[PDB]
């Protein structure tokens, strides 16, 4: 199965109350391992996973440098988008970036990502082929023409296929104990009468990693995607995840409904029936 590295950056302007806040964060799969916060006392790239502290002081020096550079650049990119879009200097604005690579079971590079969003909308992105750009609008066309001319795609493709996969592969080795582990979900059901006619059946899955999971309700063995409430997978705070799925069951038909849990950590899908 795939593994993946992602770095997510957020730059937020705040005219009058300083210069842009910049927060960057690195993940291997669903495990945070580094951070940088322009408002952090340290002003370094800090570790957030046990297995990264394994890296020498040459790693922490080179990584702090690269992310401070990112910081200063996306600071100027907030100024440029402001001009391109003809916006007042009064308003606060957001510039987010995401980059990283996926590798297969074998450490083989699978795909790479380089994307920007301005004020919550796509701005510019490297396409799947790592050769071309998608510009969301006319402002991004300008950036696209600039980057086409300066051969920025080739430069990024180099990093995505090289340094990015090299790092991910090193992390998957040094963090093997943690990253190649598979914590199966601990399951249970609850019953909540809503009316005189109906009740809620809620299917719980707790303490699982990775976050990828499927909770499905079946009625008489047929899938009940209509009238299933599914909450966003949420972090427990300990590096595992929690999720539930619910149906409003016609009261006195609880036995007709079964919950199905699928997870990388389970040899077979689990089935749960309501038991009073």
């Amino acid at each position: 199965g795939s593994h993946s590295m992602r770095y997510f950056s957020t730059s937020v302007s705040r005219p009058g109350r300083g210069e842009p806040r910049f927060i960057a964060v690195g993940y291997v799969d669903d495990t945070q391992f580094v951070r940088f916060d322009s408002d952090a006392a340290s002003q370094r790239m800090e570790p957030r996973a046990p297995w990264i502290e394994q890296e020498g002081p040459e790693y922490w020096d080179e990584e702090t440098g690269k992310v401070k550079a990112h910081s200063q650049t996306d600071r100027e990119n907030l100024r440029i988008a402001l001009r391109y879009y003809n916006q007042s200097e009064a308003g606060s604005h957001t510039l987010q970036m995401m980059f990283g690579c996926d590798v297969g079971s074998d450490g083989r590079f699978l795909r790479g990502y380089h994307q920007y969003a301005y004020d919550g909308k796509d701005y510019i992105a490297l396409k799947e082929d790592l050769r071309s750009w998608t510009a969301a609008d006319m402002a991004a066309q300008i950036t696209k023409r600039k980057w086409e001319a300066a051969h920025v795609a080739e430069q990024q493709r180099a990093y995505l296929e090289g340094t990015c996969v090299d790092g991910l592969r090193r992390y998957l080795e040094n963090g093997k104990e943690t990253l190649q582990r598979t914590d199966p979900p601990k399951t249970h059901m609850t019953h909540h009468p809503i009316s005189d006619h109906e009740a809620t059946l809620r299917c719980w899955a707790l303490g699982f990693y990775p976050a990828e999971i499927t909770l499905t309700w079946q009625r008489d063995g047929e899938d009940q995607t209509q009238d299933t409430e599914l909450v966003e997978t949420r972090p427990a705070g300990d590096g595992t995840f929690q999720k539930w799925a619910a149906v409003v069951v016609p009261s006195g038909e609880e036995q007709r409904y079964t919950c199905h849990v699928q997870h990388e950590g389970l040899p077979k899908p689990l089935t749960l029936r309501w038991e009073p």
């Binding site: 960057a24 690269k66 550079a69 650049t73 980059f99 600039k146 990093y159 340094t163 990015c164």
Partner: peptide
């Protein structure tokens, strides 16, 4: 590993 270079818009 973070990438090395970042471009202006």
């Amino acid at each position: 590993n973070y990438n090395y270079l970042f471009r202006l818009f």
